[PDB]
Structure 1
Amino acid sequence: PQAKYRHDYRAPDYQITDIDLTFDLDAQKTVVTAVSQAVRHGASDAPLRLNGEDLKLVSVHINDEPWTAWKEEEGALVISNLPERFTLKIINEISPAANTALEGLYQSGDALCTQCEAEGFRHITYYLDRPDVLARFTTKIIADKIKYPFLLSNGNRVAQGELENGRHWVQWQDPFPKPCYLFALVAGDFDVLRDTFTTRSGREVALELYVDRGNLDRAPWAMTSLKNSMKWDEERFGLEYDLDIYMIVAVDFFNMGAMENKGLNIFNSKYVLARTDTATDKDYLDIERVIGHEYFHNWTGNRVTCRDWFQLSLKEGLTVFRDQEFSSDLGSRAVNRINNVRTMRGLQFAEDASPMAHPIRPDMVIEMNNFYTLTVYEKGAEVIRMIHTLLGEENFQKGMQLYFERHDGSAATCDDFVQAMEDASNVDLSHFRRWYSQSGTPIVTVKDDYNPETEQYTLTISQRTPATPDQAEKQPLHIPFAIELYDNEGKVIPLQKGGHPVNSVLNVTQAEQTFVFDNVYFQPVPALLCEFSAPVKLEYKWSDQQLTFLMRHARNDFSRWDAAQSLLATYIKLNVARHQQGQPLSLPVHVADAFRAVLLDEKIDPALAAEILTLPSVNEMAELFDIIDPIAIAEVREALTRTLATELADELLAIYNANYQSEYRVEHEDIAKRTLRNACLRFLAFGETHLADVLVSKQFHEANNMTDALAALSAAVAAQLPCRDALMQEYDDKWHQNGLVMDKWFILQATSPAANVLETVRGLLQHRSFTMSNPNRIRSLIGAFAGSNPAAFHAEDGSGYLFLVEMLTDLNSRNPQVASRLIEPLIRLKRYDAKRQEKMRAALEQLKGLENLSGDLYEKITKALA
């Protein structure tokens, strides 16, 4: 399998302007007829090269003439000797029931549905499967009326009929030209939740949510979120929906979260279905985010699409930024920002230090489905947020307006977007563009000096990005570096120099530079990299007292959390080193005191308190170390939880009780209180055993919502409490028929600290609720073990690696996309000690030798073994 390169992009020799599709649908054999209107742009002697994968070609006609001047090659149908304008007709067969990979046209339970992004449409017919070819689609679907009473595609229904032998048909038309990755088809039997939204200018939109029969009770929150998303995009971005119907279909078998097909989004049911007894606060908020996300793509991805797949972040970074702004505006902006920062520092930084490191606009790709990444999405969004920081809201919106004005109805590039922002705002983004081309995490080092004689404070800021495996050459970036200076009373010191105010977003553009501020009347405590203003590691030699001072006084809640993170990082690193020497946890009294104060502060927002009281995950902890010791990190996390539970026991119980709520509401103030209460509960579970067991068992039994039940169950597992086995059985007995709810329980099994966790996980491959055919089940059991239980995964005997090899051996052939997601923990081997590296390398070498190794795994394995 061959790498493709961004610098090799060239405009297509042929365009397709209009395609008429007919599907004679059947699970075993579907017949596709595709009539395309084509136009030659290249030389008269260039052939038309159509992509196709696993298609049985039936016939090829050019203007209704059976064509002889063609050949099939690996992945292609190459058609020679064509006129300048012509009608291409292809008939071909495919087999939905054989499609275990879930790319193209496949079966999800009894429904048929599609996934075409990135290069899945070529699994349906021979086409110009590239996103710079936009065509007007009409889609006629013919099927068994009893099995498939609903036949859906993009746009509006234009024709319908009934046939003999119990078949019927529906034809759809979408007036907006689209790349084929935005094509969708759905056939099946559903319950349909129907609603309407009226746009600001008066366009009436029919909203239709299709769910499996029996699930209408779980649909209203997703419908509500859709209306919320539509309203927000109008208020914040000035964007309205552009069609007459908005269809969402919830399917149980899906490789990612959801997909923005124009007017017909297809969602993993995990990001649709919610009831208060089945879904947690986090599930509700994730539904909200993902509903929003797909909706936001209607403009940022559909009305303006991607020229080529190396431009993926053009739509993904921007749409993730939008979904974060949506969540943040409707909910707690501080909690959103906190959680997105946790993702960046703990999951994305790790990728940027891995063999799979890439810039947000990649230069080289073997399998494009490997580049739907934390980098492209989350780091992408941080890049867009840097633009927002540099420009301000008003100029940023002017940029958005110019981007759409120039590019509406076309496929564009990352560079076009940056250019729109620069031209609308008059801010120079030439240097800033380097964020698109350079991989790896920059390290920003800050040193300070206060001069009492001149009342001047000097910051000396330096930047470096370490080389990555993809790029030996690194240069300085344009780093927006936001600061605030605090006096001894906690008040903000105005930033100024030579009698003029200085913007608090410093432009850090050199390897090293100095910034000098005047009229600094007291030695400052700085808040540095405010609201994580660039996606960088900060190196500043904080005292513990500066950090606890910021925890009390900083004016943005984010900085209060972030200071607590920096305080904890010191003592996490201490205690991991101690663990490796056989010594127990050591923590200064004044550190415990700082967290006590958070618990007892009656003015602090409980949302903020809850996050300060949520310890960094084992993933975020790992990023503090050059060499990861996953057992020490897991044990230190536990010991720190135990020590805090003991030291703060009375305060924890008092806050736990004070935040009791009898009514359950999916409302932000209530969510915050409950997050704080359950954060207290987690510590209390690790206190004295009898009280822990009683508190946790009683919460599990008395809970009137899954947030509270699951928090108790999760605490019983984590603390290995006496009640654990009974509670886990109770949950299985009640919920085994419900896969989404059982996912939570598989995660708890997979992430258990028990010594026999791997044995239990293997045994669960036979559980009544588990199946290797379902990506959600795979991810919740196997993925969670490998990715979220690094202590067990990285068991010194190598057993975790062997288990993953066995699962990947099946998944490589069944569902390579899922396989490639699951291999990620093994490609991190160079972060581990020599003995672990050796075992992980041997595991990778076994996988490299697989017969029929997928391109998906090949890419990652060869980068890892290099």
Structure 2
Amino acid sequence: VDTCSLASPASVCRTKHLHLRCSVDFTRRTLTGTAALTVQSQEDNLRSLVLDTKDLTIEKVVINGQEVKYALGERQSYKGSPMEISLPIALSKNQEIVIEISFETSPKSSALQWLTPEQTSGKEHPYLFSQCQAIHCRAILPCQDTPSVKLTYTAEVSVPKELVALMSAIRDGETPDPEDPSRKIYKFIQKVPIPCYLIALVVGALESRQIGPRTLVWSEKEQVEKSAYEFSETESMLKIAEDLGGPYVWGQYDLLVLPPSFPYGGMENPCLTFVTPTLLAGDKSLSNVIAHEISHSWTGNLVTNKTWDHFWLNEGHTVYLERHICGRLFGEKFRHFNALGGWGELQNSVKTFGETHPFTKLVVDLTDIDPDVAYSSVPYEKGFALLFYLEQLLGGPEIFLGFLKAYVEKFSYKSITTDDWKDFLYSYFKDKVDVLNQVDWNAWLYSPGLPPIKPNYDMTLTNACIALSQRWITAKEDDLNSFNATDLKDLSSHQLNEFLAQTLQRAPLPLGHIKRMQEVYNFNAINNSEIRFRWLRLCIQSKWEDAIPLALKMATEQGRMKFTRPLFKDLAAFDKSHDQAVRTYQEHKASMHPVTAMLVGKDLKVD
């Protein structure tokens, strides 16, 4: 039972295909058109069905060329409104019909951000992008908005002719719009069955540059050169992912670099990964996000979580593959450094939520919880930690990667639960069951707080970070003179970031220490978004007023929630910046991503 969805469940009927014909109206900020769902009955004598919707305007529903009765129920907060459609003829089991729904989205659609020309790089044209995960597809089109249903799709999208439309699908040509010569129609085909959270659309003044045999990078013109360089390791990561996961089945692997308000580091939309411009560090140092999105082509997009309660299946496995891609490229000690870092991020999450908090459980009950509110690092890092613990228990990475490949093969094109995964784990490791039975499954899967066992981590690359962090924390005023730019001499950007993460775990530090750190290391000059984020958080929590405008600026000049949410929370917790923080949020709120706006509002306790 998918408690996040109001639609008929997969046991009643299932959508097999969506054909979408729509037009993007920037003047009204609406997407208008028809969603033709090919639906298969799973029941005898089926006479109605229910779809998810959210802030959609329904004009009509047509079946067999005639209009049919439908009714919208009362809104159920973040779940939206259920739409019940009365079928004109009862359906037998396995019978398929096509239902054509004429609809229009709201400007306030939680799936969409509409940008004015001034919010873009080029300053001449507007821009639109979608983000459906978890349960925002219903805010774009009526559908069974649950990952327990997989469908193919085709789409024809009419846009002002100076703009480009792209989707999570193979591009299938473009034509002038017969109804309107100021417009172009772009066509798309997704021939691999996907859950609807993977439907994606962007419309804007986009250019592309080829960077590999199956990869173009797309962005506005002013970011193309920088993006092509930043993501140049993409093909080599794909080749490694294919070795670990099996054949890449999606055809193309393209990258789209969004405007700064994109809410996540990346989103694994099939054929067209979406990424934040905050990855453009200039030195390829944030490419683990690409490794992660690439890995989702197997874990998540091929093997899918059946409901959002099982989100850790998606993310834990993807982080686990991500870290293998990085270990292949850069070495096993580096996989261990990243793993141990992730454990630190898990410690942070548990501390933030509280060690008994239900969102710190690996499997979470989302019954009356908005998935956006429950979202955190826990499914990523507690899920990773479980798989890394199992790897070590079961004989190492080579053996556990054998299991991962077999898992992907076993459940490809399916949607599965934690019990499905556990069952196959036990099947695959039949000869190691006594080992598997040593695992505290109930604690790992269902208990809050940190895991009951911490895996073994090589420390080679982490030692220097810990050492320097500890020097700073134990330093007294008369020790500050001994610090110098040469302390950083042999540290990579990854290690600088980890040194700050370690030091942030003990914040605040005395203000004079933070001032000295700026004096000798000039962290204010670093534009790596990961480093700059942690440094500004350290400055604000240690109450350095000078850092207030820097922090306000980073919080609002991009909108990746990983950075915007904690920065606003830190600025709000600091008495000197509290008023500016809420004022700044109030000013930017209308032009923010709708989900980001909602979450920052809740964090700030404003409205």
TM-score class, shorter: 0.7 to 0.9
Q: 1:244 aligns with which of 235, 251, 255?
A: 251
Q: Is the 8 A contact 1:399 1:423 kept in 2?
A: no
1:412 corresponds to which residue?
A: 416
2:456 corresponds to which residue?
A: 531
CA shift at 1:209, angstroms?
0.7
1:793 corresponds to which residue?
A: 573
Q: How does 1:713-862 map to 2 (within 5 A)?
A: 719-720=514-515, 751-752=538-539, 757=544, 761=548, 774-776=558-560, 780=563, 783-784=566-567, 786-787=569-570, 793=573, 817-818=595-596, 822=600, 850=607
Specify the SS of the correspondent of 1:214: helix
2:85 corresponds to which residue?
A: 79
1:232 corresponds to which residue?
A: 240
Specify the SS of the correspondent of 2:84: strand
1:363 corresponds to which residue?
A: 365
Specify the SS of the correspondent of 2:364: coil
Q: 2:386 aligns with which of 383, 386, 389?
A: 383
2:161 corresponds to 1:154: no
CA shift at 1:191, angstroms?
2.9
Alpha-carbon distance in structure 2 between the residues aligned to 1:745 and 1:673: 11
Alpha-carbon distance in structure 2 between the residues aligned to 1:403 and 1:443: 23
Q: How does 1:424-439 map to 2 (within 5 A)?
A: 424-426=428-430, 427-428=432-433, 429=436, 432-435=440-443, 437-439=445-447
CA shift at 1:437, angstroms?
3.6
Q: How does 1:173-184 map to 2 (within 5 A)?
A: 173-184=189-200
1:270 corresponds to which residue?
A: 278
2:221 corresponds to which residue?
A: 213
Q: Is the 8 A contact 2:10 2:149 kept in 1?
A: no
C-alpha RMSD of the superposition? 4.2
Alpha-carbon distance in structure 1 between the residues aligned to 2:14 and 2:497: 59
1:338 corresponds to which residue?
A: 340
CA shift at 1:128, angstroms?
0.7
Q: Is the 8 A contact 2:343 2:381 kept in 1?
A: no
Measured at CA, do residues 106 and 180 of structure 1 come closer, stay the same or move farther in structure 2, by a change above 3 Å?
farther
Q: Normalising by structure 1, what TM-score?
A: 0.58
Per-residue deviation, residues 613-657 of structure 1 (Å, max 9, x unmatched): 2427xxxxxxxxxxxxxxxxxxxx9662347946x93xx66x928
Ranked by relative contact order (alpha carbons within 8 Å, sequence separation 6 or more), the top structure is 2
2:143 corresponds to which residue?
A: 127
Letter in 1 for 2:130: T
Measured at CA, do residues 264 and 305 of structure 1 come closer, stay the same or move farther in structure 2, by a change above 3 Å?
same
Measured at CA, do residues 773 and 43 of structure 1 come closer, stay the same or move farther in structure 2, by a change above 3 Å?
farther
Q: Is the 8 A contact 2:358 2:364 kept in 1?
A: no
Alpha-carbon distance in structure 1 between the residues aligned to 2:535 and 2:74: 48
Q: How does 1:681-700 map to 2 (within 5 A)?
A: none
Alpha-carbon distance in structure 1 between the residues aligned to 2:209 and 2:32: 31
Specify the SS of the correspondent of 2:539: coil
Q: Is the 8 A contact 1:131 1:307 kept in 2?
A: yes
Measured at CA, do residues 22 and 212 of structure 1 come closer, stay the same or move farther in structure 2, by a change above 3 Å?
same
Measured at CA, do residues 817 and 357 of structure 1 come closer, stay the same or move farther in structure 2, by a change above 3 Å?
same
1:92 corresponds to which residue?
A: 103
Measured at CA, do residues 435 and 402 of structure 1 come closer, stay the same or move farther in structure 2, by a change above 3 Å?
farther
Q: Is the 8 A contact 1:119 1:181 kept in 2?
A: yes
Letter in 2 for 1:76: P
Specify the SS of the correspondent of 1:294: helix
Per-residue deviation, residues 104-147 of structure 1 (Å, max 9, x unmatched): 4644733222111111111111111111111110011111111x
Q: How does 1:284-303 map to 2 (within 5 A)?
A: 284-285=284-285, 287-303=286-302
Alpha-carbon distance in structure 2 between the residues aligned to 1:409 and 1:809: 44
Specify the SS of the correspondent of 2:327: helix
Measured at CA, do residues 822 and 676 of structure 1 come closer, stay the same or move farther in structure 2, by a change above 3 Å?
closer
Q: Is the 8 A contact 2:465 2:498 kept in 1?
A: no
Alpha-carbon distance in structure 2 between the residues aligned to 1:306 and 1:312: 6
Letter in 1 for 2:567: A
Per-residue deviation, residues 482-502 of structure 1 (Å, max 9, x unmatched): xxxxxxxxxxxxxxxxxxxxx
Letter in 2 for 1:373: S
Measured at CA, do residues 386 and 58 of structure 1 come closer, stay the same or move farther in structure 2, by a change above 3 Å?
same
Q: How does 1:561-600 map to 2 (within 5 A)?
A: none
CA shift at 1:424, angstroms?
1.1
Measured at CA, do residues 264 and 76 of structure 1 come closer, stay the same or move farther in structure 2, by a change above 3 Å?
same
Letter in 1 for 2:412: D
Q: Is the 8 A contact 1:296 1:322 kept in 2?
A: yes
Specify the SS of the correspondent of 1:818: helix
Measured at CA, do residues 9 and 292 of structure 1 come closer, stay the same or move farther in structure 2, by a change above 3 Å?
farther
Q: Percent of aligned pairs with the same residue?
A: 19
Q: Is the 8 A contact 1:246 1:263 kept in 2?
A: yes
1:403 corresponds to which residue?
A: 407
CA shift at 1:20, angstroms?
0.5
1:258 corresponds to which residue?
A: 266
Q: 2:465 aligns with which of 574, 589, 611?
A: 611
Per-residue deviation, residues 62-113 of structure 1 (Å, max 9, x unmatched): 12211125445421211124532321001111245x55x5x24644733222
Specify the SS of the correspondent of 2:388: helix
2:490 corresponds to 1:656: no
Specify the SS of the correspondent of 1:89: strand
2:53 corresponds to 1:52: yes
Alpha-carbon distance in structure 2 between the residues aligned to 1:354 and 1:805: 30
CA shift at 1:390, angstroms?
2.1
Q: Is the 8 A contact 1:716 1:724 kept in 2?
A: no
1:34 corresponds to which residue?
A: 35
Per-residue deviation, residues 791-831 of structure 1 (Å, max 9, x unmatched): x9266xxx77777666777888865643565579x7xxxxx
1:192 corresponds to which residue?
A: 208
Alpha-carbon distance in structure 2 between the residues aligned to 1:673 and 1:30: 43
1:116 corresponds to which residue?
A: 132
Q: Is the 8 A contact 2:350 2:360 kept in 1?
A: no
CA shift at 1:372, angstroms?
2.5
CA shift at 1:346, angstroms?
3.3
Alpha-carbon distance in structure 1 between the residues aligned to 2:404 and 2:494: 38
Letter in 2 for 1:242: V
- Larger CA Rg, structure 1 vs 2: 1
Alpha-carbon distance in structure 2 between the residues aligned to 1:676 and 1:810: 34
Specify the SS of the correspondent of 1:312: helix
Alpha-carbon distance in structure 1 between the residues aligned to 2:16 and 2:486: 62
Alpha-carbon distance in structure 1 between the residues aligned to 2:238 and 2:593: 34
Letter in 2 for 1:168: K
Alpha-carbon distance in structure 2 between the residues aligned to 1:755 and 1:264: 41
Alpha-carbon distance in structure 2 between the residues aligned to 1:372 and 1:43: 38
2:309 corresponds to which residue?
A: 310
Letter in 1 for 2:539: S
Q: Is the 8 A contact 2:19 2:154 kept in 1?
A: yes
Letter in 2 for 1:169: I
Q: Is the 8 A contact 1:161 1:169 kept in 2?
A: yes
Q: How does 1:632-643 map to 2 (within 5 A)?
A: 640-642=474-476
Structure 2 gaps of 5+ residues are: 76-80, 121-125, 504-508
Q: Normalising by structure 2, what TM-score?
A: 0.80
Measured at CA, do residues 822 and 253 of structure 1 come closer, stay the same or move farther in structure 2, by a change above 3 Å?
closer
Letter in 1 for 2:426: E
CA shift at 1:13, angstroms?
1.6
